[PDB]
Structure formats: structure tokens, C-alpha cells
Subunit: 347 residues, 3 copies
């Protein structure tokens, strides 16, 4: 929120949070202080009766390391766009891939869940992504209320150097070729929603040569989700089947994967919101003798207390069900439990 | 610029932009997503009838790489100052070298042009620079603007030539000064001259193969027509040991010319054509005379309003691919840019 | 100052400065341009009659290096908290260790002094630190005016990897184990104050194994200080004894050290504020033959001219009293004088 400017048809909204956060875990790469902050600007300019221009930026600033540490801040979102009334909207930039239009329904845990679990950022069109052009349509041209669809194109983001390069090169794990995706969601009743999403991206030559795991020309996702949100109850599930698109930790990609997330929450009137969730990711046909493997498997229990719209506190308990094996060790996949405590100021 | 605070003689202006930008080119180090944003603050405090204090900060944040990429944000401007009525001003910090008081006149292309082309940032007093003390004067104690500027040494990371804020030789400078002079001859027509002189550093005279000399110098003259929906401007600059011969060093002498023509239609379209070249002379290692930069630029911006615009820009590269361009890493390919921009 | 948002019980203060600054010195690691800026946000939300929530972020951005330079920006403060009227306050995040509730009394020099001198940042609870939980009480529950106290806990911040690691690892010089601290200040009059602070932290394995200097399982600080601040006069002194806590430059820690700082200032009505100060740090029982060594010793003389509350200019002159010896050279400790000139815009 925090509208700091509204004058002559132009609006500026400064938003963010300061999340004082500690993790407790036997996993030493996760354990300890996790304090961070986010700061953002949402901007809007009226051009004419039918046309609005807009932009948005969101920055993540870690505060859990020293004043001499490196790489402590990064851009989550940065895009500019036009809204054409009910003919739709178009924006280009670093934005969410459309698959998250459905998987976001389960991204509601007090602390865990979302990107980093069954999917990641810079992971084709599953979460935040460089260089997405996104068309969105509301209520199917003002005709069918509650029916939303989106169409998305992403240009190649390639290697640092050599034949596969682009200006903005990165590691094979965060590369993509040309790709597209589409999402569709419908509020069948009030409170109840269904949704589908699909994506198709070319893979790069580095993705097919450098890591040992995952081979194929194309990465694909198919997602279906359901959501109940009403009477102080929140239930949601997401099922996603992927091809060459799910990270098998640090070792590469899974040729096939099946991802499942489900969550249930209740909002009490005095501000407490308990939460229980289950998440799994099942990888199939992995090279080097790995075969079928659990990529992710945990039960999540926790709660958030909302003091008001600007302040909350929370605990989250990740009960890790993975068995420690040679795949989990070599891929860097944590098999330990984790508790999180946080105190959050939001603006 | 959005005024977010104005109370008790202190004002605070928040400004910036989000530039959704894609490049298309066979040069793979240029091609692809180039989305970035800029954010800044301009602050002004009334001290007395004859004295105002001010500061400004401008930050660049790239948004075209991943959340684990490094070195994606940097400060472009950061300076504090005093304004003594109309009798001029003084500021210290990271700011534009006074040469840009004239070369800024051709820095108006939809996307290309400006720093990175005939001159760069951290390039003596040609653009943005660390540690510049700048005295400016309107109406020469009429309509005649004068600046005098000093810059302290910015030297090597370590060794003899070090300062606290060390960097590579391409972005080093010794003690230097500059001066500029601009004048509105008619209404709409301006002329301008600028000169800079800086000591070079020991690393600049020892690590790169190209460019030797104790001093860097720039002589610039420029003209501008800006009236009747028409914008014409040119800039001619001669340099000694000051212009970068790509990654190979500096050019002992160079001649840079920039010219641009634009028209601004009432309904918001602004076509643009421009020509830029940089001619390097007397280069070591058998290079002799060499084109450093040569291209025609065509494109256009459509302004929806003062806060939103779209643009296309086409760089028609005229450099020939040769031993110098390859070794110095100078691109010879064309580029097309497409962008959509929100500004506040 | 700069309240940019105050609406429905929520307020937001945008603060910072732009410091145009140049150092003159024969020390090449210090000499030259030092321009930098600070930006931050103080936020506060009223929750109920007895409870206020708040948070604060402060970022430091260097502007003295190039647009391709590395590691030019960092977080100084990031914390979130709750204030429960006169039962106290609690916050967690990156914040000041409580030792600084006393040593801050001498951190008033025009430019020098403060962190970097007798103590540094990420230096146990002596200054800004990762992951401190801080309980504060002012006026002793409302019963004794001018009596303030603090209790503080800090989780381990360990190595980058290995046995001693946490998620947010750093080098041995900025590491800490589990630790606590306490402070107590009393305003005897409304200008005269006395204060004490204590801290105790576990040392980490790398602090005992990598550097040459300093051995021990615990880091301890004892600090007493005095302050006179009224009638335009400012006198302040601080004495601190440390054990395994004071940095011996790059060589490690001093098994014990004695730090002394004293400063006197006067505020003229036209805005000039002269300052003289003296600072020293005496290290004892150093290994490798060093024995007793001066770690820091200098006299400071300077002045600040305030144009108003938003703009000032200053000179500061550090007259360095260290002998150039084997210790100072090997520990990277500067022995040269420094002059600073600055012009500062603040909001």
C-alpha cells in the first residue's frame, strides 16, 4: 500500500516488508538468521478513457549477512505495461510466468512453499522470469464473469559465452530457449475456482550437455489446480506434470516429474491463521542410475498471527519426509526438518 | 519527477523509470532482454534568501538477469551542493563531467547514442565521473552559462598509483580540470564549447598496448536548434589519449562527430535520424588510423503522455570487420531495440 | 525526517543523506574520493491501545567507485519489532549490539571515530550485527525516570561451510557464536548521564584456527561511559575492556584490549561546532612475540558548520600517533594522518 503520490492522473504506491526471521535446523546451509526486506513501487498513469499505462518494480534485500558480503540484493520484478480497458493488458519485463497463475493458489504457507520447492525462479515459465511478454484478458472480453486467460512469450536467455549466448547469460539451471505459455482460470461458484496452465520452451545446448541429468529439445509443463476460499476457510491443490523442466537439485533436470501441493487453512476472527500442507515432487527416468527419485517431500504445519494489515508474526514447521540417499547428497537436497520464527512489518 | 515531500522549505522529488527493453542483433553480447530501471531522489532545502542546499542520487538497477546474478545495480549520480541565488552553484560527488554540457545535445536518440558510443562513463570528464567538484554560473555574472570543474585522481587498485577507490586503467584518471561555455545565440539556437585536461596514470601508460602520453585532453564544439517542433544538433570533439580504442587501450588522437535530426508531431510521434563516428589516429601495434565507431541511427518514440512511451531504434552499423575491431572487441553488427517505458 | 505517509494509524518516514566527501592522506587505501549516500525507512503501525508495531531499514550506497565495480551497496539495519507501552519493546534483525548504547556517546566526531576505530561492525555485540533479539525498557517500567536498560541475545553466525557453518556464513573476523549482552544508562540530571554495558559471546572454531592472534572460547566486553550534553556543551568518555573481542587488524584478535575514547565539543549559535577528541586501543598478550601493542592511537580535531537541519559541511583532522612497526605493517593498521572535507545534504 502506502500511496505516496496521486496527482493529475498519476499514482505511485510504495510497498514492501521487513521480515525478521530465524530458521532452526540441523541443515547448516539453512539454519540461522534469515532476516530480509522487500521494497517495491507500483505506478499507474491514465493516458485516456480506455488506456492506462503502468509499471512495477520489486527488490529483495537480504539483511542476514555482513556489510562486506556479496550479492545480497536482486530484482524480483520489473515490468511496464498497457491496460486497454476490457480488451486486456500487455506487459514486458521480469515478471511471473503464467504457470504461477495456478500454482500460486498453494503458495500460501506461513513461510515455506512456493518457489524453491516444487519449482524455482528463472525456471522457464514456472515462476519469475527474465524477458516475458504477457497478454492477459479479464472476464473473456467483459462477457463471461470470472473467466481469465493469459498468453505469454519468453525470448531465449542463454549461456554467458559461446554459440548459445545472449547478453544476459547465466547457468544452465536458469537458462531457457524460446518459449510460450498459457493459463486459464474460472470461478465456477463464488469461493470455488478451477485453473489450467501449459508451457512449452526450447531447451539450450548447455542444458543438454553440461549437467548429467535431463535430455530433450523441449521443456513442457501441464498444471491443474483447485481452490476454495470462503467462510474463513482456504483449501487449495495444485497438480503439475513436467518434461525436462523440474530441477533435480544441482545435478540437472528430471526427464519427467510429477508435482503435488495441497494446503488447508482457517482464519479465526481474532487474527490467528493455522495452516497444514503437503508437498511432493517425484522425478522419473533420471540418468546415471538414479531412476525414480523423490525430489521433494514434506508435511508443513504452522500459523500466522495478524496483528493488523501492517504487522504479523508466524511459526512454520517443515516435517521433512525425504530419505537421505546418494541422490539427495549429490544433488544437494536437504532431508532435515526446519522451524521458522518470524516477525514482519509490512507497508 | 514526483514531489513526495514539500514542507518547511524542504522538498523531495522521487523520479525514475522502468524500461521494458529487448535488443535484436547477431552480436550475442548485445542481443536479448535488456529490461532495467532507474530510481532517484532530488532534494532541495532553503537555507536563507541567498542560499539553497541540494542533493541528488540516481541508481541503475538491471532486471534482465537472474536473482543469483551479480553486479546488477550501480550508482550513476550522487552529489551534494549549494546554490548561491542566481550567482551560480557548487557541487561535489559523482556527477557529469562538464564535457557533457555540450555533448548532451546529441544524446537524444530513442535508445542508442550517448555514453558507450563516442565516449564512456568513468572516462575522464566526458560523462559521469567520481569525485568531481563543479562550479557553475548562469548569465556570466546574460544567458551565457559557464562551468569550471576539478577532479581528483582515481587510480589503481593497489601499488604506487592507488587510491581508496581503485579501478582498471580504462576507468582511471589523474588530477584534471574542465571548463564549458554555452550560449543561446538566437532563441532556439545554441552554441557551446568545452575543454578538459587530465593527467593520465602509470597503469594507463603501461598495461594496455594502445595509448601513451602524460595528459588526456578534449576539445569540443557543438550546435543545437530546438524550436518549431524541430530538433537539430551536432557535436564535434577532438581528443588526445582520452578516447577508448575498445579493450586495447586509448587512441593517441581521435575525432568524434555526432549529428541528429528529429521532429515532434503534435499527436506524440517523434521520428529520429542520426549519424555517429569515432576516428582513431596514430594507434600502436601497426593499427595506424582506424574506425572506432561508425553508424547511422533511425527510429522513433511514441509518447502516450509525459509518463508512458514506446520506441524503436535501429543501429545501422557501417564498421568493416577487420583485425582491429575483432581484437578490440568492437561490434560491427546491426541492432534493433524495442521498448515500452513507464516514467515517474 | 521526511514523513511521506501517515494514514489510518500507519506512518512511514523516509530518511537518509548524500555525503560529498574527500579524504587526503599518504595512506593510499584511504586517500581520495569517499562520496556515499544512505537511504532508509522508519515505519510504525498502531495495533491497539497498548501495542505498536514497527520496523526499520537502512541501506548504504557507495558512489565513489565506477558503474562496473563490485559490492558498492549494503544493509546497515533491518529489523521489526513490537512496543508494549512501558513494559518495554522487542525487535529482531540486523541491529546495534547493546554495547553501542554506551559507546555511541563518543561517536560524535565530524567524520572519524565510531565503527572502524576501537570496535567495528559485525564484531560481536559492539556495533551493527546479524540476528540480534533485543528487549529494551525505558524509565524502568515508568517508575524511575531516565533509567534505561536492554537485554540482548544473538544467535551463532558461523563459517561459510564445514562443521561451524550457518546459512549466512562469513570470514572469522565477522563470525560469532551464541552470545548475550546487557546495558544500563541513567540520566542523573537531564544533561548528565552514566552508563555500563556488558557482553559475552562464544567464539567460533575459525576464530581460533585461522588467524595467528587471539585464543579463547569466549569474547567479553565491559564498558563504562559518561556524558555531559547541555548548555551547548558536549563532553563524553567511554572506557571498554575486552577479551578475545577486539580486532588486531588482519592478524586476529587481541587476547585482551583496553579502549579509551574522549571528546569535547561546543555548539555556537551561528551553526559552527568545533570538536576535539582522543581515541586509543591498547592490545595485550598478543602471540608471535608481539606482546603489548597499540592497535589505535590518535588525536582528532575538526568542526561542523550546520547551514540548517538539512545541510552541513565539515572538516576533520586525524593526527595519527601510532609508530610504524612490524605489528602495524603486518596487521594492515594505518599510521598516516587523514584530513576529511565534506558537504552533506540530509532528508
Amino acid at each position: 500500500g502506502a500511496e505516496i503520490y496521486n496527482k493529475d492522473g498519476n499514482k505511485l504506491d510504495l510497498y514492501g516488508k521487513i521480515d525478521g526471521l530465524h530458521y532452526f535446523s540441523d541443515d547448516k546451509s539453512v539454519d540461522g538468521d534469515q532476516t530480509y526486506m522487500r521494497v517495491g513501487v507500483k505506478g499507474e498513469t491514465q493516458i485516456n478513457d480506455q488506456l492506462t499505462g503502468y509499471g512495477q518494480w520489486e527488490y529483495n534485500v537480504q539483511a542476514n549477512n555482513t556489510e562486506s558480503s556479496s550479492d545480497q540484493a536482486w530484482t524480483r520484478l520489473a515490468f511496464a505495461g498497457l491496460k486497454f480497458g476490457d480488451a486486456g493488458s500487455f506487459d514486458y519485463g521480469r515478471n511471473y510466468g503464467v504457470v504461477y497463475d495456478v500454482t500460486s493458489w498453494t503458495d500460501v504457507l506461513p513461510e515455506f512453499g512456493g518457489d524453491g520447492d516444487t519449482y524455482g525462479s528463472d525456471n522457464f515459465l514456472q515462476s519469475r522470469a527474465n524477458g516475458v511478454a504477457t497478454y492477459r484478458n479479464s472476464d473473456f472480453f467483459g462477457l463471461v464473469d470470472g473467466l481469465n486467460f493469459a498468453l505469454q512469450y519468453q525470448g531465449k536467455n542463454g549461456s554467458v559465452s559461446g554459440e548459445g549466448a545472449t547478453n544476459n547469460g547465466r547457468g544452465w539451471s536458469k537458462q531457457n530457449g524460446d518459449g510460450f505459455g498459457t493459463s486459464l482460470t474460472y470461478d465456477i461458484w463464488d469461493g470455488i475456482s478451477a485453473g489450467f496452465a501449459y508451457s512449452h520452451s526450447k531447451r539450450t545446448d548447455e542444458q543438454n550437455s553440461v549437467p548429467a541429468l535431463g535430455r530433450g529439445d523441449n521443456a513442457e509443463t501441464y498444471t491443474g489446480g483447485l481452490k476454495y476460499d470462503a467462510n474463513n476457510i482456504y483449501l487449495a491443490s495444485q497438480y503439475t506434470q513436467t518434461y525436462n523442466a523440474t530441477r533435480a537439485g544441482s545435478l540437472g533436470f528430471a526427464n519427467k516429474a510429477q508435482n503435488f501441493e495441497v494446503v488447508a487453512q482457517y482464519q479465526f476472527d481474532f487474527g490467528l491463521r493455522p495452516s497444514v500442507a503437503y508437498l511432493q515432487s517425484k522425478g522419473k527416468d533420471l540418468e546415471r542410475g538414479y531412476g525414480d527419485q523423490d525430489i521433494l517431500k514434506y508435511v508443513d504445519v504452522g500459523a500466522t498471527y495478524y496483528f493488523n494489515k501492517n504487522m504479523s508474526t508466524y511459526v512454520d514447521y517443515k516435517i521433512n519426509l525425504l530419505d537421505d540417499n546418494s541422490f539427495t547428497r549429490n544433488a544437494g537436497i536437504s532431508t532435515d526438518d526446519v522451524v521458522a520464527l518470524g516477525l514482519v512489518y509490512q507497508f
